[PDB]
């Protein structure tokens, strides 16, 4: 497709159960961050 397999439309793609509960982690780290 057009881009990466581990990143979907809205951010990092959430595989483990930590990401479904804590989905800040999907899109945020640090100040330097882009989509």
């Amino acid at each position: 497709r057009q881009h990466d397999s581990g990143v979907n439309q809205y951010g990092l793609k959430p595989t483990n159960a930590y990401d479904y509960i804590n989905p800040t982690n999907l899109i945020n780290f640090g100040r330097g961050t882009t989509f």
Binding site: A17, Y18, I21, N22
Partner: peptide, 24 residues
């Protein structure tokens, strides 16, 4: 002790050793 949580603190991290202690 004080029998209740004074702090409402929920860490969201689930380290695998804390959970399956049979295998690690």
């Amino acid at each position: 002790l004080k029998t209740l949580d004074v702090r409402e603190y929920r860490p969201l991290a689930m380290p695998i050793e804390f959970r399956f202690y049979q295998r690690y």
